């Protein structure tokens, strides 16, 4: 099924494939891709990468 994450800390994108995220946002349809320490997910209509220590998994 689908995995969602809560944003716990602000992060501004440093590369174009990264999300800019803000505390309180839910990132949806989260996937672990090949990259270590990062995740991929949907936010406000787009997809992108985000650091996995800025967010908490909704279980």
């Amino acid at each position: 099924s689908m995995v969602d994450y809560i944003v716990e800390y602000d992060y501004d994108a440093v590369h174009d494939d990264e999300l800019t995220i803000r505390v309180g946002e839910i990132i949806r349809n989260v996937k672990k891709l090949q990259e270590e320490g990062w995740l991929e997910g949907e936010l406000n209509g787009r997809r992108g990468m985000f650091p996995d220590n800025f967010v908490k998994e909704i279980k």
Binding site: Y9, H15, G37, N53, F54
Partner: peptide, 10 residues
């Protein structure tokens, strides 16, 4: 306590 983003694979 603020997190530091892990390095990208790059």
């Amino acid at each position: 306590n603020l997190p530091t983003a892990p390095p990208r694979r790059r």
